[PDB]
Amino acid sequence: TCETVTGCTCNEGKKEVDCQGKSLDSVPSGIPADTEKLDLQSTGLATLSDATFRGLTKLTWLNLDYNQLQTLSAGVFDDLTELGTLGLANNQLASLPLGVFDHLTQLDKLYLGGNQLKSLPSGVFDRLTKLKELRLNTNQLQSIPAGAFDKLTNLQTLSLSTNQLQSVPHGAFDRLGKLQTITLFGNQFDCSRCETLYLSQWIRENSNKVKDGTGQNLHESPDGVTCSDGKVVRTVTNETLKYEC
């Protein structure tokens, strides 16, 4: 029972504020300025702005899953320099602002699954050099920008399943030396395109990474990623595309 945040529950010891499942008309004003964990999942939040989290500089965990957010402001996360986990899954996000995550240099997990993203801004992840987990699955992504993932040298899990990808740019995964798990199924890879060749060779070379989920102890599914014409992607070689390429 929160003394200072009406109708939310608290653990002042653990610096936790839990408002999950409370109908919110705005983010409450009485949140302790030393709060570390803030749960706002399923509160019905419809907008955020540059000032919404202002002053919550100790936050390390913020959960905005299952709200009604359609856009974010460029500065909404500005103050939150110690954030380690950001939950933005299962909102209605149609786009991300340029620089939206740039202050989150300690971010460890970023959940953007289950939105309506069609594209990613130029360099949106570049500041996130400690990111271990990125979920972009179940969106509407039409492409990935060249070098989108290049700064993500600590990344272990990248989820890209259920999107609208027809290819990935050449060397898209080059810098991901710590990758363990990637999801690629449910896209529409156009295996007539020369860009396929980078992707098929990658999957042959990294076949133990290609999985049907993000959890531990799941056996690889390198043949579960299929071209829009039904062919398994990893079977497509330079020789397969000798005519086209």
Added chain:
Amino acid sequence: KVFGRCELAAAMKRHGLDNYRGYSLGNWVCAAKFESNFNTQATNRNTDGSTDYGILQINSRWWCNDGRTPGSRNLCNIPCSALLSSDITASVNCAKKIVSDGNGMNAWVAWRNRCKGTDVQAWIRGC
């Protein structure tokens, strides 16, 4: 187990999903395809510390008990481990409770994203 498309359609039909709550067989096949890639053992962890399990990605917040999820309700009365089996009976039985809970198949986010409102019967054609 990774099911083939027609193999799963056959299994879901055997277990009574065709037209369950108004949802044709194609809805259930398509849902499995985009939720789990037909993989009975796929899991995905969520921000609130719950986990989505198995071929239909049933969550440990409301539906199954995984012993590590805060405020769990276990409405299917089943360890989540039972939803990782190669036999789909338990996930089907629990899916029947989910689709009965008021919002139909809207619970399934990848279904809602990729299958809802499409020609889902394509997922059982050729079988």
